[PDB]
């Protein structure tokens, strides 16, 4: 086979890379983990170090408390028997309070109270994780693009679980914590709202989800196709354009009539992906609060 | 016109078919034999869509819809206006998509670059063919294919979906979705990471790839690397489309019942 | 604009058009304005304007890049226009592999090595890379390098590695006259007994451009090396 740069042929190692220091509080850095030659066929072999500060400990603890709040509820639905637990694990479900409890936190533990406890733990874990993605860039002197893109995903999860349920009047509108049940929630969401395919923000969300697989296939293939010219060293190609960046651009110019730059393709990329959950969150948020039936809404507009 | 650096690359050579006969450009676009083939297939399929629009009686592109033949036609040809135009448009579509990929190969050769892009494009083409060819042949009728209309083909997705219950329970569908979501997550993170290095905080020099690795190690304890993320992005998006085709090739053909029951291989073990 | 959903969707569409227009101009920071084939600017540039310049401050005192700005190849291009009409290939006026045109092209990058985060050469032969060694896969050092003519051009005497990213990027290969050339890692196939190079025949290795220092490689040198090697796919093809 003419070499395709999809699996490293010769792995190399030196002293473990401890990373840039900049303004990182090195106290909160772990040691280096084990090297994985298996991973090294596809990407880097080095594992760690990781950074765990105040925020990371908070998010981890709160995240485990979310997982164990759903875990104990799954054991109680399994009558505490390890066989029904392992067998029906995808069927268990920690459901929100019923619509009568409204936006109240007085729901008993066994019909919405434990969901509210879990959601609180999840809300703390996610938002302290988001602060982490901001602070880890800040400590390194980097832009805040990761935190900003992460906000887009958070917007959807916030609309589904918190903002839309509140504007609707009851926690019962939020998503259940279960593998199969939240799938069922998703299907029934589209049914009760007159077919989500006619929510034009759902159509945009899909175009960008498809477009993200399109663009990443295009960009990943392109970079591999010019890796023979150092193309994956994208930062130095941005500061000092080489024949990799030029041939990459000319492939696409000659194919479809226009092209990117080494820097600019990553702006197309971040926006393609971010728009998925941005449009999606809007479409969900308008559902039940402004539009009860998307198909019927669609017919009268045009 | 040319990009400022383009001229040194516009040399003869690399064609698969025709020699230097089609070895030229029109504006930015390279032609090549398969450029001429793409143009012919695309123009014809566009003309028949235009004529299927006059047969339908609308010029509103949100309403035009070219349907495949009725299920009773099986895998046989159909008169123009009852699946024939769909049938010829599907042939031109397949011709243009395949020509496009071969034109891409000629472009790779003239530029001296790997062939990863037309290879990746082929996954999309096989997903299209899974839906308009492999699955309809497996099931015995062209009518199992989707119609060529902006909104009718969404109705096709919903009809097909709810014929098998909640598709959400199709395990190949679950895998494909997991790849689609993971891909957009990786795309957002890859775009964000490069931009956060090339555009650091105000008052800072450009970061280095070492900052990119440090950021993701600090964040999640692992950095896949600058080469790995492009391998991973290709692998995620192509695996998404592979399992999408697999979830549909196993639908209506090997699996006919509602999908929720696939799982009681698990819950009704003794 | 009927209800809030209609205002929202109409708003989002105006935003998306603004976003696409911004994204396209951001992607015109290199290579624009478009030029005619004689190098003069083209009349129709399209409906997107050139972006206002932006600056990058390169680390380690290497200066600042501002883009877009005045472009120039900063090298002679050995090609000649063929047709009075635009859209036809240009003809190499020498050896396209030695001249660096077509798929043998290189860019006049800075004649300095890429540095890592700590300001040290990013790419270093193992012999000067404090601590570096092979960790999995077939160790290529010492094995013969074979061309697309199935003859042996030399032997691998080292590996040039990415120090911060810990990856193999070039094989240093000794030629019959005792000199070395770097081979791009992505253009070789390391096998049980050999390193096969399908882009070049055995006798094209000596024409691989050479580097000034035995323990550092500049970006310019890398471009020259990688373009030459890749250009063999088209220009060494009579021998293949
Ligand atoms: C993939 C699995 C399903 C499917 C399920 C869905 C669902 C569900 C949705 C869409 C949506 C869309 N799909 Mg569909 N769709 C399928 C197959 C196709 C094919 C095809 C030849 O295989 C095409 C061209 C389209 C095209 C389209 C667009 C009308 C729209 C946005 C997609 C997008 O941006 O993707 C990513 C690609 C890009 C960003 C690049 C640009 C793509 C351009 C815009 C495609 C235009 C096609 C054009 C209208 C038709 C040919 C034009 C000729 C001149 C005649 N679909 C199959 C049957 N598709 C969404 C929508 O809003 O529909 C109204 C939506 O909600
Ligand atoms: C029967 C089902 C219904 C339907 C019902 C819905 C509903 C309901 C919704 C969607 C939504 C989406 N649908 Mg739809 N959908 C249907 C048909 C389709 C089809 C198709 C071809 O048939 C496709 C391709 C899609 C595609 C899509 C996506 C574009 C979109 C979700 C984006 C995303 O990334 O979410 C995934 C990303 C997230 C949920 C964000 C997650 C962020 C959080 C913060 C992550 C926390 C992780 C947590 C801490 C875990 C820790 C683990 C760690 C490893 C330790 N739909 C039909 C009509 N669809 C959503 C949307 O936006 O609609 C407008 C939505 O809510
Ligand atoms: C978008 C509209 C719907 C929706 C529709 C769908 C559909 C349709 C599908 C999924 C699928 C999944 N969804 Mg969902 N999903 C929604 C919102 C969520 C939220 C959330 C924070 O709101 C979470 C945590 C999940 C989580 C999950 C995973 C179990 C799975 C793969 C997601 C993925 O690729 O992540 C990308 C991220 C990563 C790969 C990194 C992090 C990975 C881990 C696995 C994230 C999940 C943590 C989870 C709590 C762990 C479960 C442990 C076991 C039970 C022991 N969904 C909304 C409500 N989701 C698919 C599936 O397989 O379902 C069975 C599927 O087919
Ligand atoms: C009510 C509907 C049902 C359902 C029923 C179905 C059905 C039915 C199908 C899917 C399929 C898919 N579904 Mg489902 N699905 C549902 C719920 C979901 C949810 C969700 C959030 O709940 C999600 C995320 C998904 C996700 C997905 C993907 C795994 C997949 C679509 C991508 C694909 O195959 O692309 C593949 C890409 C393509 C086909 C595009 C090919 C483009 C070609 C090669 C070239 C186009 C060129 C163009 C014409 C040029 C135009 C001009 C230029 C623009 C200038 N489904 C519900 C439960 N789902 C589809 C699938 O797997 O298809 C194989 C499918 O058919
Ligand atoms: C553009 C939108 C896309 C997107 C973007 C996005 N997501 C992001 C980001 C961005 C830009 C981040 O920066 C952030 C991140 O850090 O990524 C690496 C994140 C991320 N998106 C994630 C998930 C995710 N994103 C999703 C989607 C998407 N994210 C969109 C498609 C989805 C789905 C359903 O599609 C999921 C599930 C996370 C991996 C991460 C945010 C991490 C977070 O909030 O963590 C909370 C903290 C915890 C500690 C969680 C609880 C712990 C586990 C439940 C533990 C259970 C296991 C058991 C205890 C194991 C341990 C014991 C053994 C080891 C012994
Ligand atoms: C496999 C991973 C993803 C992928 C990859 C991918 N696609 C690619 C490539 C790659 C790597 C290309 O190189 C190629 C390209 O050039 O992109 C710019 C392409 C491309 N992917 C495209 C579209 C596309 N890709 C999609 C998806 C995906 N592409 C996957 C998710 C989707 C959807 C729905 O998800 C769409 C719409 C184009 C932008 C381009 C192919 C361009 C092309 O083939 O041009 C030649 C053909 C024409 C100009 C027109 C032919 C017209 C027909 C004769 C008539 C119309 C028939 C058609 C069936 C009608 C459909 C009606 C709709 C309402 C449903
Ligand atoms: C690092 O590198 C990289 C670059 O470069 C530096 C890049 O550019 C790109 C390319 C990526 C972009 C420019 C980002 C924008 C792209 C998208 C958002 C994906 C969607 C793309 C489109 C919707 C464009 C679609 C246009 C097409 C398919 C062609 C349009 C067709 C015509 C108008 C004429 C058709 C030409 C034909 C038929 C050929 C024959 C010609 C004759 C004259 C005959 C990538 C991936 C990259 O990684
Ligand atoms: C041994 C004991 C350990 C326990 C082991 C089992 C734990 C499995 C957890 C599954 C959660 C299901 C997640 C799938 C869907 C989550 C969707 C979601 O989070 O919804 C948003 C919500 O409304 C706003 O927070
Ligand atoms: C608590 C959360 C635990 C999360 C555990 C892992 C999460 C994996 C998620 C997505 C895969 C995409 C990850 C890789 C995306 C990297 C973007 C990038 O450019 O990184 C490349 C390289 O690391 C720099 O050179
Ligand atoms: C895929 C993401 C998961 C990778 C997380 C691994 C982090 C490694 C930390 C190892 C700690 C080393 N130690 C024990 C010396 O501290
Ligand atoms: C998404 C992670 C995938 C990583 C899995 C790596 C699989 C092992 C591949 C080994 C390659 C074998 N060989 C001979 C090509 O080197
Ligand atoms: C940042 C990249 C821009 C990609 C553009 C995507 C446009 C998709 C249009 C689909 C239309 C959906 N809808 C409901 C309005 O019909
Ligand atoms: C149907 C919506 C899809 C529209 C996307 C097509 C964009 C074509 C832009 C090509 C630019 C060609 N040209 C001559 C301006 O360089
Ligand atoms: C975009 C958020 C605005 C939400 C407006 C207030 C929502 C409360 C419920 C209103 C009921 C909507 N309705 C009557 C159309 O069904
Ligand atoms: C390449 C995909 C094949 C899709 C459909 C092929 C069916 C052939 C039918 C010929 C058309 C009959 N006719 C001309 C009377 O319409
Ligand atoms: C669907 C999203 C893709 C939008 C396509 C944007 C078309 C850009 C056209 C660039 C014009 C090329 N030109 C003339 C400036 O060289
Ligand atoms: Fe990249």
Author numbering:
A (entry chain M): 1 to 302
B (entry chain L): 1 to 270
C (entry chain H): 9 to 248
What is the paper's account of this structure, in its own sentences?
In this work crystallization techniques were selected, tested and optimized for the lipid mesophase crystallization of the Rhodobacter sphaeroides membrane pigment-protein complex, known as the photosynthetic reaction center (RC). In this work, the photosynthetic reaction center of the purple bacteria Rhodobacter (Rba.) sphaeroides was crystallized using various crystallization techniques. It should be noted that the RC of Rba. sphaeroides is one of the most well studied membrane complexes.
For LSP crystallization we used the hanging-drop vapor-diffusion method and for LCP crystallization a microbatch crystallization approach. An analysis of RC crystal structures obtained by lipid mesophase crystallization revealed non-native ligands that displaced the native electron-transfer cofactors (carotenoid sphero­idene and a ubi­quinone molecule) from their binding pockets. These ligands were identified and were found to be lipids that are major mesophase components. In the carotenoid-binding region an electron density is present that resembles a carotenoid molecule. The M162 phenyl­alanine side group forms a kind of ‘closed’ conformation. In this position, the M162Phe side group occupies space that in the previously described RC structures is occupied by a sphero­idene molecule.
